[PDB]
Amino acid sequence: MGIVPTLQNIVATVTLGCRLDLKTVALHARNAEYNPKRFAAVIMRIREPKTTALIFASGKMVVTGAKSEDDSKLASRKYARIIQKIGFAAKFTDFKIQNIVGSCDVKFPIRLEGLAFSHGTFSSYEPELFPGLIYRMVKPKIVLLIFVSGKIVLTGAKQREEIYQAFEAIYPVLSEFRKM
Amino acid sequence: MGIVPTLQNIVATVTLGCRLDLKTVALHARNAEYNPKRFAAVIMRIREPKTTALIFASGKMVVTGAKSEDDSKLASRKYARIIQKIGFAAKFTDFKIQNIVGSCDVKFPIRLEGLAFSHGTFSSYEPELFPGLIYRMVKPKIVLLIFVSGKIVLTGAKQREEIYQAFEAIYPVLSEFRKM
Numbered sequence: 364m365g366i367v368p369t370l371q372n373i374v375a376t377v378t379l380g381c382r383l384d385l386k387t388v389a390l391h392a393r394n395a396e397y398n399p400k401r402f403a404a405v406i407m408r409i410r411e412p413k414t415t416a417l418i419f420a421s422g423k424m425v426v427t428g429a430k431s432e433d434d435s436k437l438a439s440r441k442y443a444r445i446i447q448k449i450g451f452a453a454k455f456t457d458f459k460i461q462n463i464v465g466s467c468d469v470k471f472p473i474r475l476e477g478l479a480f481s482h483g484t485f486s487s488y489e490p491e492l493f494p495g496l497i498y499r500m501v502k503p504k505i506v507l508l509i510f511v512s513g514k515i516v517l518t519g520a521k522q523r524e525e526i527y528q529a530f531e532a533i534y535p536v537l538s539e540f541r542k543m
Numbered sequence: 544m545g546i547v548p549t550l551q552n553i554v555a556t557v558t559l560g561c562r563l564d565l566k567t568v569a570l571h572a573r574n575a576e577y578n579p580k581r582f583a584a585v586i587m588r589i590r591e592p593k594t595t596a597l598i599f600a601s602g603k604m605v606v607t608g609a610k611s612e613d614d615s616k617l618a619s620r621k622y623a624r625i626i627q628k629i630g631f632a633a634k635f636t637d638f639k640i641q642n643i644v645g646s647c648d649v650k651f652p653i654r655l656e657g658l659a660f661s662h663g664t665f666s667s668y669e670p671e672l673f674p675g676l677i678y679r680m681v682k683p684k685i686v687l688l689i690f691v692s693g694k695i696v697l698t699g700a701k702q703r704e705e706i707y708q709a710f711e712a713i714y715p716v717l718s719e720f721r722k723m
Contacts (some may be wrong), residue, residue: 371672374663402657417660425660461663466672480597480605483641487686487698489552492646495673497686497698506686508673518667518677 364468364514368530370523373429374461377439379422379453383446388418391449407442414438418446422453425461432460432523463520467530469513472542478509482536498533505529509537546714548645548697548706555615556641558603559623561632565600571629587622594618598626605641612640612703645697645706652691654720662716678713685709689717 385405389397395418396406405418414428414435426442429435436458443455475496479488488496495516498507503525508516515533520526569577569585576586587596594608594615604622609615619638627633655676659668667677675690683705688696695713700706 372669374660376663402654404661425663427660427663462667464667464669464672483554483556483605487642487644489644489696492551492644492696493675493688497677497688499679499684499686499699504679506667506677506679508677516669516673518669519679 364466366467366469368465368467368515368517368526370430370463370465370526372427372464373432373435374425374427374463375429375435375439376457376459376461377424377426377443377455378457379418379424379443379446379451380456381422381451381453383418383420383422383451383453385418385420388446388449388451392445394445407445409438409441409445411441412438414442416442418442435460460521462518463523463526465517465520465526467515469515469534469537469541471513471538473509473511473513473537474540474542475509475511478536478540481540500529500532503529507533509533546647546649548647548710550610550703550706551644551646552607553609553612553615553643554605554607554641555609555619555638556603556605557619557623557638558636559598559626559631559633560636561602561634563598563600563602563626563631565598568598568626568629568631572625587625589618589621592618592621596622598622615640640701642698643700643703643706645700645710647695647697647710649693649695649714649717651693652722653689653693653717654722655689655691658689658716658720680709680712683708687713691722693717 389395389405407416412434414426417425426439440455443453446453475488479486486498495508495510505517505519517526517529565585569575584599592614594606596606598604606618623633623635659666665679675688678687686698697706
């Protein structure tokens with residue numbers, strides 16, 4: 364954690380084009396996992412990059428784990444590669460980023476009680492229920508988790524610019540709410 | 544069979560439409576934290592309904608702590624006495640609710656990983672970053688924190704009925720990912 368936000372995880376969905384039969388893919392893709400009773404989705408996995416993919420019987424695929432849009436764009440292609448070879452006529456289509464989670468550390472203790480009262484229609488602070496303050500930004504639609512230590516978590520960004528811009532908006536507020 | 548959300552805290556803001564000499568009323572009230580160099584307003588209080596109250600010279604006050612819309616309103620009336628009997632135009636008026644937070648326990652661990660990766664549209668989940676899963680409802684505007692133990696926190700409702708509404712709509716989802 365440093366002052367500059369760094370993305371932690373990226374979730375993207377790829378539409379394969381065709382409906383799959385999960386049993387055959389779990390029975391041909393050398394690296395896969397299936398549990399129809401517990402969850403209707405073949406959980407595949409790869410190393411370059413380390414992303415996990417959830418292939419659903421509708422062609423819809425959800426790839427998590429990448430730290431960059433290049434890696435989730437890359438990884439997604441390769442997963443489509445893995446099923447194509449098995450036999451189905453899948454094709455990398457409509458890659459859409461679903462959510463991005465990032466973090467940073469302003470490096471100074473913050474008065475969550477003061478920020479909660481001041482930015483009252485945005486914040487919530489119930490220490491006995493959750494340690495952090497939940498801040499709901501309406502633009503960009505980001506939900507920030509702010510901890511008494513200075514740690515920050517920005518969840519919900521549909522694209523990289525929103526994580527960075529959300530921090531620009533909150534920083535000068537936090538810096539005005541540090542202790543002492 | 545009933546599982547229903549309880550109200551943990553209601554933050555209300557009501558205005559005693561009249562100017563208030565904060566030094567004075569802090570004096571009389573005596574056990575009211577009024578202090579220089581910081582926050583210009585008097586912090587009142589009461590044993591029951593156990594609520595804290597930030598009174599501002601702008602005639603406005605923000606009462607916190609009430610576990611119910613009626614108790615708040617009640618604590619909102621108590622305060623316009625301690626600062627009325629002291630000859631003042633403490634006119635109780637425009638009472639508004641700023642936020643309502645609830646909590647609930649479904650009593651079955653949840654498979655958050657499955658919820659998040661199939662509901663990434665709303666869910667934010669990073670076990671190495673923060674505890675729990677963040678779910679953002681669009682209708683009604685509510686942010687729910689869901690933990691593995693099955694305890695959930697509902698925040699941001701401006702009205703009571705939205706807590707029940709939010710939980711009534713997410714419960715079937717949580718039952719689907721109930722870890723057995």
